[PDB]
Amino acid sequence: FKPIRSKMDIASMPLVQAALKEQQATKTALDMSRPMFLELGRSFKGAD
């Protein structure tokens, strides 16, 4: 039996693809549950 391949990358699917956009937003953009002084001196980028 010939082995099949895959023609749709799995992160191009709708549910997964939109949960990845949301994942980005949260880490970069925003703060948390630790004291504000610690969050106010953070660099979003890391090496640039």
Binding site: S6, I10, A11, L15, V16, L20, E22, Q23
Partner: protein
């Protein structure tokens, strides 16, 4: 077969790579949609019979297909056809849970086009039976899950044509 998660693991295994940031992002994109996939499967499973009934009613019966000379003439063939319909529905539900179409190739599409050519089974009519079940499914499962269920019905139908 493979799912979202094993698709990634095997793609990295052949390169012998530990999972990196790009991989981890893909897996998150699956996990984050997971609860919704489960709810959608429970709706489809529990409405299975009604989906087939409404899909056949819109796209198959009341027609030449069911009247002497037609491929779903005889109780014998009518039963085989809605049996098939149940396969499609059931496997599409697997593909959508897995978030990967590979099972639809391995266990449903492989050789099926020619099997249908050999028996005389009308391909175009079968596709309409698939796209009618999709229509019903998309109503029942709601905004959350509609697009995700839909794609594996579309995978099935471009696999035959």
């Amino acid at each position: 077969m493979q799912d979202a998660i094993t698709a990634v693991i095997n793609n990295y295994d052949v390169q012998g790579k530990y999972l990196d940031g790009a991989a981890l992002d893909k897996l998150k994109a699956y996990f984050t949609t997971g609860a919704v996939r489960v709810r959608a499967a429970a709706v489809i499973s529990s409405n299975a019979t009604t989906i087939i009934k409404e899909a056949a009613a819109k796209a198959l019966i009341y027609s030449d297909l069911t009247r002497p000379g037609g491929n779903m003439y005889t109780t014998r063939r009518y039963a085989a056809c809605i049996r098939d319909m149940d396969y499609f529905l059931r496997y599409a539900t697997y593909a959508m849970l897995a978030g990967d179409p590979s099972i639809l190739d391995e266990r449903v599409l492989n050789g099926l086009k020619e099997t249908y050519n050999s028996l005389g089974v009308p391909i175009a009519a079968t596709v309409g039976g698939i796209q009618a079940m999709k229509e019903v499914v998309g109503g029942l499962v709601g905004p959350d899950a509609a697009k995700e269920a839909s794609i594996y019905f579309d995978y099935l139908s471009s696999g035959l044509s």
